[PDB]
Structures are given as C-alpha cells and as structure tokens.
Design a protein around this ligand. Structure first.
Ligand code: NA
Lengths: 661, 661
C-alpha cells in the first residue's frame, strides 16, 4: 500500500548545485554549469537555434583539450552528474514537437567523435534504475520513428535494466516488465515495434531475466482475471509464438524452475491458461506448437487430443498439483472446469478415488465403534485398578478383538497424519487453517489414545478422563468425511468457516460484558450466610458466571434477591444485562450468522468440487510403484517422429445452435 | 419544506388600483393610468405601433412641465409604483418575438433625455428583491444580444441584489447565486456571456458577497454529490480560473473565514473537491495555479507532489479537520479515499497514532483490573466501617499499589474527558449522540469513583454500591476501544446504532402493553390470604410485572390460578398476553433487528476508516510543542522563488491497461 521510491525519483525541476561544485573549471562567471544546465533546458523546451549555438561552444570548450581526452571528458561533462543520465534521456523523458528534429541534430554531433555508440548505450550508475538506457525511454514514449533511428544508430536491443525499480513485492513500487527492451513493447501494446525489433538480427528472444524469465513470463504478469474490452495481452502472446516456430521456447524454466504454463497457473491468470492450453492454430509447418488435435468433429460432437505435458502428477509441480494446493486464488473454480483439466480429474475419481474414499471411510467408521464398546460396556468401573489383563484370555475374547484394533489404527493414522506436519502450512490464521484444520484434529485424536493406553499401564486416576475426550473428539473427526456428497460437502464448510468467522469475533466482546457484569453481580451479596442461606443464591465470582451464561441461553430464574443489600440496583443491573445479551447480542450474532450462511449457500459447487480435488491428490500421493494401469493414454505421435506427446480423448458440446442461415 | 415568498411575488396579471390613486392628475377620463397601464400591456404583448403612439403622448404629457422636473417625473410616472419596477423589467420578465425590436425603440426614447443611464440602472425599493436591476433579467432570460446592447448601454455589471430572495435557510425559498451579475451567467450555463462579461473592463471579479463570497463560492453551492450527465459546473470553474491567472483568488476567505476549498469541504460537494485538489493543467505561464506536479511517471507508476495548503492540522480549520468533525454529510467516506487526503491520513497513523492508541489502550486495561482486585478480594465485608487505613502500612502494601493507581487515573481521565464538554455538540439526539456518546460514558465513570472514595472517607452505607456500578460501567467503556480492528470496529457501531434505533422504538410500545395487562393481571386476586397462601402467586402491581417480563423472555410458569376469583378470564388474558408478546412482538423486534444489521454489515469499511480518522486528530489534538519530527515534507519551491508550497510524495496506479493499439 505505500509506494516508497526511496531516492532520487528521477527528472526533477528542483535542481541543486551538488555535482557542478566538484568540477569548478571556471573562466566566465561559471564556464560549464552555465553550459551544462543550458543544454538541459534547451532540450527540456526544444528551442533549436539556441541549442545549435550551445553545441557550438561545447565543441569550442572541448577544442582545447589534452591528449585524446576529448571523448571521455564530454561524457563527464554531459553525463555522470549524480546518476549517469544523458541529454538523450532528457531528450526522451519529455516530449515536444521539436523532438525528432533536435535528436537527429544531437545524433549528428557525437558522430563527429568516436564514442557515439558508447554514448547511445549509456546506463545508470544510479543504483535505483541501474542499467536503464535511452532505448526503453523511446519505447516508453511510443516513438518508433525515433526508435527506427535508434535501431539505425546501433544500440544494444538486449540490455538488462536490473535496478531497484522492479519490486521484491508483487504489484507495487514499480512494475516488472522483465528488464528487457523486447518485452517492453509487447507489454505496452506496440505490435509494430514488436515486429520491427524481432525482425532485427541482434534480437535475442530466449534470453532470461535475473529471475530466469523469458519474454512469455513477462506476459504472465500482465493480464486480468476476466475478459477486458479487447485486451492486447492475448493477441501479443501468440504473435510472438507465431514468429517463434520452436517448441523449446515454452520448455524454458526460470530461477524457480517454472514453465510459462506452470507460472501461469501459479499467478492465477486463469483465462490466459485457457488460451495457453487450447492452441488450435492450423498451419502445416506450424502444428508443432498446436495443442488441440481436432479430427473427428461432426456437428455438436468434437474429437479432442490434448497436449498433456506438465499436467498429470507424473513429475513434480504439475499444473493440477499447483492449482489445488495453492492459497491466495480468488477464482480457483475457474481453471477447474476447463475441459482437459476437468476430464482428467473426473476420470481419476471414477478410476481411482471412489474406491479409496469408501475404504478410508469404512475403517474409520469401525474405529469409533470399536472405541465405543470398549468405552460403554467396559467394567473399568468394576474395581480393576491394577493389572487389567488377567488370565482366562483376559475375561473374554471380544475384549481382545476391541483392544488390539484400536492400538493398530491409532498409530496407523498417527504416522499417516505425521505426514501432515511436512513442508506445507505457510501461514497460521489463513486458508491453511481453513484447509488443513482436519489434520490437526486428526492427529491429536490418536495421540490421546496412546496416552490413555499409557495411562492404562500406569493407572494414574486420569486414564478414563483421557479416553472420554479422546472419544468425543473422534466423532468430531468423523464429520470430516462429509466433503464428498453435494448435500454434505457444502455443509461442513459452514461450521468451519462462519464459526471461526463470527463466533471468534463475538467472544472477544461478550466476555467483556460477562467479565464486567459478573463482578458487579458477585460483589452485592455481603457473604451473608456462608452457604447456609445463600445456597439458593449466588456466591463466588465463578458461581454467577454459569448463571448469567445460563440467562444468556434462555435458562435460569430471576426471583433471587434475598441477599443483595440493596435489591433494586441488583435488579436494575440484572434486567439491563438480560435486555442487553439475549434481546440484542444473541440475536445480533444470528443476524450476522444468516447473512454469511446465505453467501455460502450461493457458493455451493465451488467448494464441492475442490474438496474432491483436494483429497484425490492426497490419495494419489498414497500410491507407490504400482501405477501402470492408473495412467492415461500413453505413447502418441502427431504424424512424423516417434511419440511426441501423449494425449487425452474426445469431448462434446451442444452449441451447433447459432445464426448464420 | 414550505416556500413562503412572504409578499408581492412579482409580475402579477391581477392588478389593483393602489398606486395610481395617489397620483390623480386627470384630464380625460383618467389621464395617466390610461397612459401607464397601456404602456405595460403593449410591452406585455409586444404590439409596436400601438406602443409608438403611447410613447408619443408620453412625450406630450411630459412636454408641459415646470423647471427641469421632466426627467424625474417620468421616473415617478413609469417606475416606483409599488416596488420600483420599470418597463424594461416588464420588457424582460416575459419574452416575445418583438422584444429586441421594442427595446431598441425604448432605448432610443430616454436617450432623448439625460437620465437613461440612471434609468437603465434602476433597482427595487421593494424590500424583497432589493437591488434587482434590469441586467440580470436579460441574463435570466438568456438574451446576450440584448445584453450586448445592455453592455453597450453602459450599466453597472457589478450590482448587488441583496434582497430577501437569497435565503437564511439552505436550499429553499429562493436560491443563492451570490447577488452578482457575473456569477449568474456562470451558474446558469452561458459561457459566452461569461467570456463577454469578463472581457469588459468594468468587470470586477474579486468583489465579495454580503457573505463575503467571491464568484467561486457561488460555484460551491451548485453541483451534486455525483457525476451528472456532463454538468457545466466543473467546466465553468476552471474557465474562470484560466482567465484568473493569479493565485490570490482562492486565498480569499468569506465572512465566515472560508477558503473556497474550505467551503467546498464544508458543503460536502465531494466530486468538485477532487477536481479542486488535482489541477494538472500544464502551461508554462500557468502552472502557478496547478497543484499536480507529475514529473516521474513511467507507465503504471506516477510521481506526485501536492499543494497541501490548508490540509494538515497546522492551522485552524483544516480540510482534514472539517471533513471528520462534521455532521450532516452523506458520502463522508468519499473525499477520504482521495489520494493526498488518504495518504496523509494513512502515514500519520503509521507515524503517530499506532503508538498512542496502543498506549491509551493499555493503561485503561490495567485500570479495570486494578479496580477489580480492590473490588473482589476486598475485606470491606470484614467489618471495617470506620477508618479503613490503619497502621502496619495499611494491612498490606498491595492495597496501596491498588488504591493509589485508581485515584490518579480517575482524575486523569476526568480532566481529559472534561475537554469533551468544550465547544462541540450542536444537536442532542443526532450523530453527536452517535459519535460523542463514549465521552458521556467515559466521563460519568470516573465521577462515580471519586464519589465512592468520598463515600469511603464518609461511610454512609452506600459506598460499596457506588463502587459496583462504577465498575461494571468501566468494562462497558472498555468496549469503546473496539474501533481500530476491522473485525471489531464494525461491531460496536451496531450496538450503538440499532439499539438506539429499534429498541427505543419498541419500548415506547411494549410498556404500553405491560402497563395495561399488568393491572389487569393484578386486580384479579381479591387479596385472598395476605401472603400466607398467595405466596405462590401474584400480589401487588410490581409483583406481576417481573413475571410477565419473565414470560416475555421465555421463563416462568403458568399453572398459577389459585386466587383469581374467575379462573378463565385470568387465563384468557394471560394466554392472549403470551401469544401477543413472545409469539409476535419479541419476534417482531428481531425481524427489524436483522434487516438493520444487514444494512450495516454491508457498510463496513465506511465506518471503519472514519473512527480511525476520528481519534487520530484527537490524539493529534493531544500534542504540545514537540512536533518537528511529526511533520510532512517541508520547504519546497516550484522552480523560481523560494519555497512556494510544501508538498507530499508519489503514488501508483495499475491501469496502464486500456485500448488504443
Ligand atoms: Na432471518
């Protein structure tokens, strides 16, 4: 939210006398700052004939010069003031109708010397914009005609302006076009400059950022979450790719090891990825970049073959891997209903996950029941404080059928949920607590069990209490297998979301009343009996809390004024309390409840698909070495070589309906 | 809501015979009212040749005249009837296609005499429209061609029509264009007349209203809260300022001492102030009026310097001062997200108020806790009625650590909240009770404390009861520091707003039932036992109230009919009561509750920023003499003189996205 340019912003009208104080060299009232600054303003205005004479004395001052120091001196004369900026910078920061005319005069000046190629390729010694040259500024101010002269000048079109200006944050303090002169035109919608630059033979394309980024990674960090009114970002994108002609250009990773597809999922520019994945451009020496092999399309049916390169979980960092396990995406449901991403998901549950979810459900269902009968019919209240495993096969066989099953599946889930403590969970009180909250409550469940068995060997009079809280928490985790059905998968989010949303807010307020009114209630008893008459009354501070909270829920009684010492202010405080909490605040929280619920009841399918998509990779994570049948359509060529890329299969869409007569 | 023109509205067709009865001077059946009224209708219709002969006899009647009384007589003949209106008024109140032709004839008439300059600059002796002349009426009826003749006539274009017609109220009984002929054209969208009037050399601009208002203050009282369909109000505004050329013209205050910026915040015309504050018109002899110094703009980044004249709290009546402490503004959140107003706010909390809010929170947090332990563990129930400060350092040291802290911070807040009794609070049951309600409840808190300590020296058997109500009220004010967080700042408004909104309405109704049904309940007992058998029953009127209110909340029992003397009408009244209040009215109030809550839950951020903005100036009010580090970017010049105006710093906006190819 702050900007913080942190220094020397650039091009200020307010100009001190700091650099010219070091170079005195004065002959007439100031020899050089009256020469240097007058160059600037004549550039800054555009007055030509004034500038013609100022360049004449620049030759005249550099006429008197020692051995071969005349080119280097004028650089120290004209540039390297505080930052390294030039007159060509000042020629190109502003704009005026004299600009093209003064530049070609200014171009002809240092052509008389031998440093103009060095002079055109100056860059900032300034730390902030380190590497910024005069080319990009013309590209910034949209002067291809100047740039045509600048291309005719012979300047490096492959510079790297790796200064501070591109940010360590995301979308602030200066943008990330990616330090290259080529991507600047493409990012800023000048396709003619894109063509003309790429037509030049100096033009590398495949060079990389400091981040290791090509030109396409810049295009990832541009577009929106939606269709704008005819953006250029998509039509630039293929326009490079039409000129690219080689499949390798998207095989490039970055410093983070990101395919441009892979980054496009990571940033979440969802609509671009739809255009990325489709690529149905038909041209016989150009199908190598194509990704949509339609052959059998007969009206509303449509045959499909997709590219499927980094999409399945057969490598690290799949595009289905990254879309699910990411935080901070708004429209995460978008990209999911995209056809090869949707179908490969939907087949996989049909082929792999329907069987595994039903199995992992059924074991955990017996697990509470096995916990139940060892907790309700148990004769641990039948005076068996030492050594409960006696002879006669320990009083029954079915005690062993219960006790053995629990001990295995406690540590089975425990090592299973020990894997939840792995590299995940970046944040604390965000979506990871709205997603991995089950893994906390799964894990602490079985730890209570083993501790209770550890308390069964060491009978320490709290063995049974640990079991009880282990058991009711077990049925709470039993609710976590309510994310598959539509009619239940919407349901467990709402107690996960809104209760953490509202009820945490409310009990940072309601306690503050209850801490206040309670001492007010508890002070007005004057101790009066010491529990011989005020037994039907209040008492210590804890004893009124569980009555006011009882009054909060709508329970309790009121005609208890027998020891109050002033039995109206006792009542006036009480009636004010009841009219505060139950009339208003309890009803206040339900009004905030039902509005948030109504938001979630609208967003039903978006959370329902995603939880299915969440667990299916987790089950696919639990699959060693035996995966040949659990694959998808290998070994496919296009026509010519061996198998270029394995694909997937056909689709249908019933919108042959249109109007063309 | 009434209009009330209060007199003599003007230009009626219904005409009595009141002024002509004083001037008889009759020679033929009426000499002059048959002359005077026939002038009017011939003007009122536009018949030319009829009017030509009527002007001829006007010369003929004024032919016979004594010594040099002929010009003054015709004024008393043609004007000064009841109000002072002229024929030129009647020439310009209506309109007809003969109008320009009859006026130039009528202009040529009194040109034969020597009073036509006085005659063109007549004004109303009428008290209502005192000072209204014939120029504005042409400006009203949009006749610049007539006005071109009127400018050629030589009339004062700088008149002051300071009659009743501009109101003592705000937007009623006649408008406030500001009594000047110049502002009338600008307010009524005739820019050609604006140019032509300002082209004239008689034209003052910098003259002031009776209110001390220039032309721009008139423009303040015009526009809307929103973008209309291409209003002229903004494009008139700079059009004066383009012709103005001097910075002084907005330095003018009024009778109230209001800069035109300062008034524009006061009236709340929010969109205008955005245009006021920006002023990015680039022209080299015109940047002196400009306020947006963009120099370093590189795509989606943008360098900014703002004017910052009457904006910070370094003088009286800042524009940030007035936007916060004002009532009666609808879109008060607008103007706040405006960039130099937003940023100077947001930096100031980051620089000054985050530390002060956390400090003022933490002292008040200990204050209730120190109040708590001196209230719960206190042995004032241990029979210490006289002189509770005994020897042995008063029974413990930690009693002195409690008792000293409370006495200081009671009178610390008391003198602090005595400043809340200052010049503020215009109204009683309006937004000031929705804003300064904490200052009431803050202040009465500590007064209860000192009174309780005053009751500790003078043990009057109510010392402890005052402490208790002092304490629970203290935790109620503890809720007032819930305006900083987003998740809590929305929350305390809702109990402040809706409870005063609905529950005050409901208990002007529910008592009326409860006052009714209770006497109905209490009359049917026939006294029956005098508290030996009806102890399990009702009794006096107060004894049934706390049971019906108990039934209102959903508590109590019903099979109590033992002393009723007719135990069905007792029951029929009771069942009718319960089906009235709990089935309906208690549920009625919650339906009104949740709708109002849902309105407020939408408006979350608007109240959240504002309370932060409220207290930060209050903390900035608490800052003497040591403010040099707590400033903002002083001593800035434009280029030429010394420091014209200190500014603020740069911004960013990511909407380089558009379509221009
Ligand atoms: Na409702």
């Amino acid at each position: 939210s702050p900007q913080s340019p942190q220094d020397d912003v650039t091009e200020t009208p307010s100009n001190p006398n700091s650099p010219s104080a070091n170079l005195a060299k004065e002959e007439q009232r100031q020899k050089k700052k009256r020469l240097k600054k007058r160059i600037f303003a004549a550039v800054s205005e555009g007055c030509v004939e004034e500038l013609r004479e100022l360049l004449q004395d620049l030759q005249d001052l550099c006429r008197r010069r020692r051995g071969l120091d005349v080119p280097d001196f004028l650089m120290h004369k004209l540039t390297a003031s505080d930052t390294g900026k030039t007159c060509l910078m000042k020629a190109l920061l502003n704009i005026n109708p004299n600009t093209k005319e003064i530049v070609r005069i200014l171009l002809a000046f240092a052509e008389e010397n031998d440093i103009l190629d060095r002079f055109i390729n100056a860059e900032y010694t300034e730390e902030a914009y380190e590497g910024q040259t005069a080319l990009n500024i013309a590209i910034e101010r949209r002067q291809g005609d100047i740039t045509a002269v600048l291309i005719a000048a012979g300047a490096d079109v492959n510079a790297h302006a790796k200064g501070v200006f591109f940010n360590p944050k995301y979308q602030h303090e200066g943008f990330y076009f990616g330090e290259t002169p080529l991507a600047l035109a493409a990012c800023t919608n000048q396709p003619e400059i894109v063509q003309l630059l790429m037509e030049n033979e100096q033009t590398d394309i495949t060079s990389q950022d400091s981040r290791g980024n090509n030109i396409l990674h810049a295009l990832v960090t541009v577009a929106e979450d939606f269709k704008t009114q005819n953006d250029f970002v998509k039509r630039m994108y293929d326009m490079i790719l039409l000129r690219s002609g080689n499949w390798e250009l998207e095989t490039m990773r970055n410093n983070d090891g990101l395919t441009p597809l892979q980054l496009a999922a990571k940033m979440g520019k969802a609509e671009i990825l739809k255009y990325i994945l489709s690529r149905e451009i038909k041209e016989k020496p150009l199908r190598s970049l194509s990704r949509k092999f339609t052959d059998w399309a007969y009206g509303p049916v449509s045959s499909s073959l997709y590219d499927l390169t980094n999409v399945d979980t057969t490598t690290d960092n799949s595009v289905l891997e990254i879309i699910v396990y990411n935080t901070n995406i708004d429209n995460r449901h978008e990209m999911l209903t995209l056809e090869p991403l949707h179908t490969l998901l939907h087949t996989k549950w049909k082929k792999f996950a329907k069987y595994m979810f039903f199995l992992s459900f059924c074991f955990y269902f017996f697990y509470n029941i096995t916990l139940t009968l060892v907790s309700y019919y148990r004769p641990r209240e039948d005076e068996d404080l030492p050594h409960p495993l006696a002879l006669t096969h320990k009083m029954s066989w079915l005690q062993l059928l219960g006790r053995m099953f629990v001990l295995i599946w406690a540590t089975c889930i425990s090592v299973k949920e020990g894997i939840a403590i792995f590299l995940l969970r970046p944040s604390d009180l965000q979506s990871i607590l709205s997603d991995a909250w089950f893994h906390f409550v799964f894990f602490v469940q079985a730890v209570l069990v083993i501790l209770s068995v550890f308390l069964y060997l060491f009978a320490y009079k709290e063995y049974l209490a640990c079991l009880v809280l282990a058991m009711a928490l077990g049925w709470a985790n039993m609710l976590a297998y309510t994310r598959g059905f539509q009619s239940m998968g919407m349901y467990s989010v709402m107690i996960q979301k809104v209760i953490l949303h509202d009820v945490l807010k409310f009990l940072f307020v309601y306690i503050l009343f209850l801490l206040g009114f309670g001492v007010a209630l508890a002070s007005l008893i004057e101790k009066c009996s010491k529990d011989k008459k005020d037994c039907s009354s209040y008492g210590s501070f804890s004893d009124a809390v569980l009555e006011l909270f009882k009054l909060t829920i709508g329970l309790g009684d009121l005609n208890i004024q027998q020891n109050s010492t002033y039995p109206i202010l006792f009542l006036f405080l009480l009636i004010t309390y009841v009219i505060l909490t139950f009339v208003l605040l309890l009803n206040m929280l339900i009004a905030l409840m039902g509005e948030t619920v109504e938001n979630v009841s609208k967003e039903s399918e978006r959370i329902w698909r995603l939880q299915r998509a969440r667990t299916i990779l987790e089950f696919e994570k639990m699959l060693p070495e035996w995966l040949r049948s659990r694959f998808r359509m290998g070994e496919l060529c296009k026509v010519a070589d061996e198998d270029f890329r394995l694909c997937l299969r056909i689709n249908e869409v019933k919108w042959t309906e249109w109007k063309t007569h």
